[PDB]
Design a binder for these strands. Structure first.
Ligand SMILES: Nc1ncnc2c1ncn2[C@@H]1O[C@H](COP(=O)(O)OP(=O)(O)NP(=O)(O)O)[C@@H](O)[C@H]1O
Ligand SMILES: Nc1ncnc2c1ncn2[C@@H]1O[C@H](COP(=O)(O)OP(=O)(O)NP(=O)(O)O)[C@@H](O)[C@H]1O
Ligand SMILES: [Mg+2]
Ligand SMILES: [Mg+2]
Lengths: 331, 331
DNA sequence: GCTGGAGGCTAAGCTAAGCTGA
DNA sequence: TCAGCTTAGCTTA
């Protein structure tokens, strides 16, 4: 058997194996792409638990017609030009294996119109080589993605899809986590056409209690302890629940963000777990939302396909900083 | 800010961010390539903790000149042709992004000679466009990879290399895990030219115990309890230590394999952790080397870039099966 | 003697609570 | 004001 180059559709389907875990991961990737384009209104429209239709609409800068084809392509992005840019990144996007993977394992139609361009355009990728065709359409300034029949072309991945309810629950979990990360963009979720969740954006210099309550819950809000802890460029803000009377209903909310990204990292969770176990004695594991800010040069984020976990250049210092911050919180 | 295709060197450097974590990951990837290729003698030579030179030599099938050129390329492999092959994986390779990534973040000089072809060939990929140069060389039947000056051209990642000692410790850990996974191949590790570890291959139907002692110490062997728990298609074989007198020195040995690949999976580790914490006190978490064998269709392995986390189609059944197996072991 | 790095399910069905229609 | 339907929480696989 010879060493032969995989056809681009097959290569993208393999990339979809790591970056597209469930319909929830498709919603996360498309929402992040909209947020990086400076969008303020995000309208997500899940149908049949994401298996049938996932539609995301935004009021972002859009994708001009000629570059629409290269947007759907693989290893093609407008967020890095060289390794130096990758060292100091601010966007939620580095590589071009985001739209390529989803378009490979589904029927992805990309409708967009930039503010400068008068007329909107559609683009969808099909075939063994994933060629893209651009048809004219009507849309306001912004972009709309429709992911239809997810894993239609990969029978094995469809076998992995769970029931309609659980898949929407995972999509709702990702929407809630994105909404907390950015308290400045309105996110409107809708399942089977019936509105499920609406978060109205609090403007810069506003009250953060209302939206956080709508996402976390009233119990978390009345039991929230807002914090601010700085040892230099390391700054840890956010709300931590009180462990004295935390209920199992509140236990599900354990989110941590590093420079505005969703972190499911071992180091940070372990630091909080040690802090909780030291000033309590047992694993009550109280609810918390922590926003950590560091120079992007002290952190490496190109570590995981879905960019959940992160590698810190100052691992022991960051662990000590988070541990001291949570220890101060429990006072 | 236009959408531009990333140059191949940059794209491969980004892939290296996820697949090439440390010199240990480079040793793991190159050793896996040799085993699947069919090798009985693997000779690894780490110099200056992997930072200066990593050389892996095998007695495998080798790579002919034209296929040698495509070996260094990205998305080029001889282990999958279509999705059906990806469903029915019996090899340790799916994508072509491992050698492309290592050749991107280092000076990779692949040298090989197949059994049939007359003479050996040395091939290396260089430049921002990653052109491949194939010069003549001398080598017996098999292949040799030399990774020199790891992360020389990526200063951002070199700062993450810890020391000479720790990097070799991680390489030694991966070598011991590979050796246990296949008791069929001789693996000879050498640091700065001084032999550190030698494991001689036990012939088919041979006694495993002596090699297991060389990898996990005599204490594991006097405290070993072999198992064969089989329910339906699921078979959990291997050796588990006794928690009655387990030392912290033995606690480092917690390896688990799914269809003969090294798993750092959340579901499996969690199941063993629950089983140990139910029939023990003070979180004893005893040492174990357990081989799970499952139908290749009921587990998905294309889940993580470094392939140490699997997605099971029957998550609850597999968790219960492993939990029951370890619970039976602890009596 | 000092120094790195942190193990840690997941999903479906049933029952209870709240809101809307008769 | 009471009954029925939908959504959330809990339990077992
Ligand atoms: N909603 C949007 N509005 C405007 N531009 C967009 C939008 N979505 C995607 N784009 C652009 O289109 C390109 C498509 O590439 P993509 O694969 O999404 O890159 P990425 O976001 O950097 N990838 P990743 O690292 O996986 O997150 C991006 O570089 C964006 O700049
Ligand atoms: N030691 C070796 N001996 C023989 N053939 C080899 C060897 N190493 C690599 N090859 C061949 O070169 C190709 C390149 O493999 P590589 O780029 O590492 O990806 P892969 O191993 O096929 N998949 P992945 O698990 O992602 O790394 C393989 O398909 C093999 O056919
Ligand atoms: Mg993207
Ligand atoms: Mg490989």
């Amino acid at each position: 058997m010879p060493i032969q180059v995989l056809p681009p559709q097959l290569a993208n389907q393999i990339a979809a194996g790591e970056v597209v875990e469930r319909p929830a991961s498709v919603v996360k990737e498309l929402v992040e792409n909209s947020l990086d384009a400076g969008a303020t209104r995000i309208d997500i429209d899940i149908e049949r638990g994401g298996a049938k239709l996932i539609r995301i609409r935004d009021n972002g800068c859009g994708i001009k017609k000629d570059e629409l084809a290269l947007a759907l392509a693989r290893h093609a992005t407008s967020k890095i030009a060289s390794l130096d840019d990758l060292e100091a990144i601010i966007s939620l996007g580095f590589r071009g294996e985001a739209l390529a993977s989803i378009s490979s394992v589904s029927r992805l139609t990309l409708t967009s119109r930039t503010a400068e361009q008068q007329e909107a355009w559609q683009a969808y990728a099909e075939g063994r080589d994933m060629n893209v065709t651009v048809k004219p359409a009507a849309h306001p300034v912004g972009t709309t993605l429709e992911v239809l029949d997810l894993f239609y072309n990969t029978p094995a991945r469809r076998k992995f899809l769970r029931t309609e309810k659980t898949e929407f629950n995972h999509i709702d979990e990702i929407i809630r986590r994105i909404a907390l990360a950015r308290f400045d963009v309105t996110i409107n979720l809708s399942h089977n056409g019936k509105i499920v969740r609406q978060y109205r954006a609090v403007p810069e210099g506003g009250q953060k209690e209302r939206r956080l309550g709508a996402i976390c819950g009233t119990a978390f809000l009345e039991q929230a302890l807002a914090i601010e802890w700085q040892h230099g460029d390391l700054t840890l803000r956010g709300w931590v629940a009180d462990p004295n009377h935390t209920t199992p209903a509140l236990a599900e909310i354990q989110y941590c963000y590093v420079n505005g990204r969703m972190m499911r990292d071992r180091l940070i969770n372990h630091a909080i777990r040690q802090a909780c176990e030291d000033k309590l004695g047992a694993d009550q594991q109280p609810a918390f939302v922590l926003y950590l800010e560091i120079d992007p040069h002290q952190v490496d984020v190109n570590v995981h396909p879905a960019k959940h976990e992160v590698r810190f250049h100052q691992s022991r210092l960051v662990h000590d900083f988070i541990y001291q911050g949570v220890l101060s919180v429990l006072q």
